[PDB]
Structure 1
Amino acid sequence: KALSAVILAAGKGTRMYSDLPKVLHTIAGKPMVKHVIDTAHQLGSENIHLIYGHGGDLMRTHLANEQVNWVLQTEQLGTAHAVQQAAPFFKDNENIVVLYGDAPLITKETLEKLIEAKPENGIALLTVNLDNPTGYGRIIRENGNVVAIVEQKDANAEQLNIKEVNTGVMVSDGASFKKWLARVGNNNAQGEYYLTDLIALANQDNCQVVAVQATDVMEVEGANNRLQLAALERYFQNKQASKLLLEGVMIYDPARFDLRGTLEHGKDVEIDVNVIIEGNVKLGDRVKIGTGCVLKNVVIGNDVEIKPYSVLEDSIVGEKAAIGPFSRLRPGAELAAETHVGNFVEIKKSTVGKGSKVNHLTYVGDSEIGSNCNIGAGVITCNYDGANKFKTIIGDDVFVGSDTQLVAPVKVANGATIGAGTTITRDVGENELVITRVAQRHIQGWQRPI
């Protein structure tokens, strides 16, 4: 049988105390709902019907690229009413899985088990045993079989003691959904059309209802507030770190590691405590990342060491380079093999050729630097007070003395040597040595305070 998905995502999320709608709060740097859409896609869903409502404009801007059917629920009249908005698109002979944009950790594997357990013309639902089931629909079983779900606000004293609860997740065929949704009313304590009434309706039709008990409680947990969200984040980060460790990445402390995107890695990679990996990051063999580093959208070659407290974004680093500590690579930084970038150095939109060193207290922006250059401490690339920002071009085997200002646009040809304290405004030729002539006054017998 084919499969499509419906994702309920219309909620305001009042207890997040936010201007965002509930499902756009992030886990590992992306909206909760994006995790759910991705899972529905990996499961092989032909269509993904996204039920949205509150924060509609924000949903559409933040999820503009998602391959979903946008189904606007103008009023939040209950979970059955939400699913019914998508029901006209259900094929009679496909399975439909109901998912929630605020329950982001549900796995493909669990959902495949749920789908496989669904009986013909019946329903499969995911349930879970909780020590404290307050708030959740209670699973009612007669002679071992599920016959109904009773919500917290509708339950009598005995039913509230039931520890097995509804996760909300269920699967049935499209025809059965249409049939039963039309028979859902709103005669209950909340005045809502409950999706949960489908269980008792199916029982009334002598159709079978199978519960699959989820064994990992956090996997099926939803987030109603940011405390719950943080619990999901920690669970997810632990899971990601455990996968990387089993793949052979040495993460010194998995509880102090964060991945917010994707990590491609070689062998014998070592990542010290308190590292954050964001966006798409690729690390070669034997890359070592020191404590406190932030890498966002970077490619790091084999045998690179990044020393502590380095922040790198949208940058490429060649093999055997050495970066840090306290180095800053801003977007467009491209460091060739065997380069050295040191403490309190900022590189922005610049290329730095093989073997070159930029080891202290330096800003290099909008520059091209060749191979085997020595960029002294305190060197700064700058511009005139003009309009746009021009380029500094330095050739191969150039020595730039400490505290030199390179005033763009300017070119320094191969083999040139620039003395310390120089202001370079004119192009420097091949093998040209430029030294600043200083005038000083010397006053003898000057006594400082005793």
Structure 2
Amino acid sequence: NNAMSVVILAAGKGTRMYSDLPKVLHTLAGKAMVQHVIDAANELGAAHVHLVYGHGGDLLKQALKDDNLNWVLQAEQLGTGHAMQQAAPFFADDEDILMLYGDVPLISVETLQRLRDAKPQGGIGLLTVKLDDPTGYGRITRENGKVTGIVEHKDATDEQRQIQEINTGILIANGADMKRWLAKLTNNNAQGEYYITDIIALAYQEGREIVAVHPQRLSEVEGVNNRLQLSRLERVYQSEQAEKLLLAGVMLRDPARFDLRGTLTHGRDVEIDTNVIIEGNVTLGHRVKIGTGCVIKNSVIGDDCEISPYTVVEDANLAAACTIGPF
């Protein structure tokens, strides 16, 4: 596959988070939302990762210091199209440019890879989902099947204002192409701002093809504007991790009362009781039993160990066959 860079849009104010911490730094399973997106970008092979931010520059730079990111400031809040224009000067004409959002944390590498496979030569790869209630969401215009553009809800007509397929806002296309379309955006809009969604029509008019793809899960493209929404995505992710673990052979006594905020390495026949929380990197050897309510953090627990209820195990390497607690 061709070289590619990634643009991560994190320019919003995050007002409904009612917080002093930049919205995209709020954590999902212990890792900042944007870090989840940055890791997926790196896993894909992004040659560069451009991060476009509104305010909170210092906090962001401070928090993401361990990553090699190209910081792109968006002086004013003029929308995604305007934000992409600020990054455009850094796009190579050889590479594909994938655009993601710092507040859509669960987007999977697997899905982004198919989006990358479906991008036609000279065209665009568009990620979309079938939602019955497009109210608010931008609608996908098609002609005899093929994608023609996107019509922003406020700009959609009653007639088209009931199209079901929705724009996730995630897409990929060649850098030179992107630079071209981005230059041709305009403000004579519902809200005097450049619409990034316009590049879809611009590319259709140039006679280029735009292929639409769908994610395995709707959760992969859910965005976060407030804490009620983050908690909801947190639950979906925990639930997904729990199901994978049970299918993989780890007995969770109640997957709805389990939280993994890190990386779990486990052996065979491990049992985890209710309300357990796993943090950082944790390894549980074969037949380890974790009592209800334990918090295991950055520790390695040997084969056959048993941890009593409500034990906090931190920065510990525990010898095999251990018996931790009274019970």
Q: Which category describes the TM-score, using the shorter chain as reference length?
A: over 0.9
**Alpha-carbon separation, structure 2, partners of 1:17 and 1:155:** 31
Equivalent residues in 2 for 1:135-150, closer than 5 Å: 135-150=136-151
SS of the equivalent of 1:241 reads helix
Task: Give the structure 2 partner of residue 176 of structure 1.
Answer: 177
How far residue 219 of structure 1 moved from its aligned partner, in angstroms, is 1.4
How far residue 54 of structure 1 moved from its aligned partner, in angstroms, is 2.1
What amino acid is the match of 1:172?
A: A
Task: Give the structure 1 partner of residue 63 of structure 2.
Answer: 62
How far residue 70 of structure 1 moved from its aligned partner, in angstroms, is 1.5
SS of the equivalent of 2:122 reads coil
Task: Give the structure 1 partner of residue 214 of structure 2.
Answer: 213
**Alpha-carbon separation, structure 2, partners of 1:214 and 1:145:** 18
CA RMSD of aligned residues (A): 1.4
Q: Does 1:127 align with 2:149?
A: no
Task: Give the structure 1 partner of residue 102 of structure 2.
Answer: 101
Q: Does 1:285 align with 2:286?
A: yes
Is the Cα contact below 8 Å between 1:262 and 1:280 reproduced in 2?
A: yes
1:194-248 CA distance string (max 9 Å, x none): 1101001101211111111335211111112222211211111122122222332
Is the Cα contact below 8 Å between 2:136 and 2:153 reproduced in 1?
A: yes
Task: Give the structure 1 partner of residue 164 of structure 2.
Answer: 163
Task: Give the structure 1 partner of residue 14 of structure 2.
Answer: 13
**Alpha-carbon separation, structure 1, partners of 2:242 and 2:38:** 22
Task: Give the structure 1 partner of residue 48 of structure 2.
Answer: 47
SS of the equivalent of 2:315 reads strand
**Alpha-carbon separation, structure 2, partners of 1:151 and 1:249:** 46
1:315-357 CA distance string (max 9 Å, x none): 2221122112xxxxxxxxxxxxxxxxx47xxxxxxxxxxxxxx
Task: Give the structure 2 partner of residue 196 of structure 1.
Answer: 197
SS of the equivalent of 1:160 reads coil
Task: Give the structure 2 partner of residue 331 of structure 1.
Answer: none
Task: Give the structure 2 partner of residue 300 of structure 1.
Answer: 301
**Alpha-carbon separation, structure 1, partners of 2:135 and 2:216:** 19
**Alpha-carbon separation, structure 2, partners of 1:204 and 1:121:** 13
* Greater CA drift, 70-79 or 1-10: 70-79
TM-score by length of structure 2 reads: 0.96
Task: Give the structure 2 partner of residue 244 of structure 1.
Answer: 245
SS of the equivalent of 1:161 reads coil
Hey, which of these two has a bigger chunk of strand by percent? 1
Is the Cα contact below 8 Å between 1:153 and 1:190 reproduced in 2?
A: no
What amino acid is the match of 1:295?
A: I
1:221-280 CA distance string (max 9 Å, x none): 111222221121111112212222233211111111100011111211110011000111
What amino acid is the match of 1:200?
A: A
**Alpha-carbon separation, structure 2, partners of 1:22 and 1:180:** 29
How far residue 67 of structure 1 moved from its aligned partner, in angstroms, is 2.5
Q: Which runs of 4+ in 1 moved over 3 A?
A: none
Q: Does 1:114 align with 2:124?
A: no
**Alpha-carbon separation, structure 1, partners of 2:225 and 2:132:** 18
Task: Give the structure 2 partner of residue 426 of structure 1.
Answer: none
**Alpha-carbon separation, structure 2, partners of 1:127 and 1:187:** 26
Equivalent residues in 2 for 1:346-385, closer than 5 Å: none
Judged with a 3 Å threshold, the aligned counterparts in structure 2 of structure 1 residues 259 and 215 are, in CA distance, closer, same or farther, namely: closer
SS of the equivalent of 1:188 reads coil
Is the Cα contact below 8 Å between 1:128 and 1:215 reproduced in 2?
A: no
Larger-gyration structure (1/2):
1
What amino acid is the match of 1:263?
A: L
- Structure 1 runs not aligned, ≥5 long: 325-341, 344-450
Number of residue pairs aligned between Structure 1 and Structure 2: 326
1:99-147 CA distance string (max 9 Å, x none): 0011011111111111111111111111111122222111111222211
What amino acid is the match of 2:277?
A: I
Q: Does 1:24 align with 2:25?
A: yes
Is the Cα contact below 8 Å between 2:111 and 2:216 reproduced in 1?
A: no
Is the Cα contact below 8 Å between 1:2 and 1:93 reproduced in 2?
A: yes
**Alpha-carbon separation, structure 2, partners of 1:58 and 1:243:** 35
**Alpha-carbon separation, structure 1, partners of 2:4 and 2:28:** 26
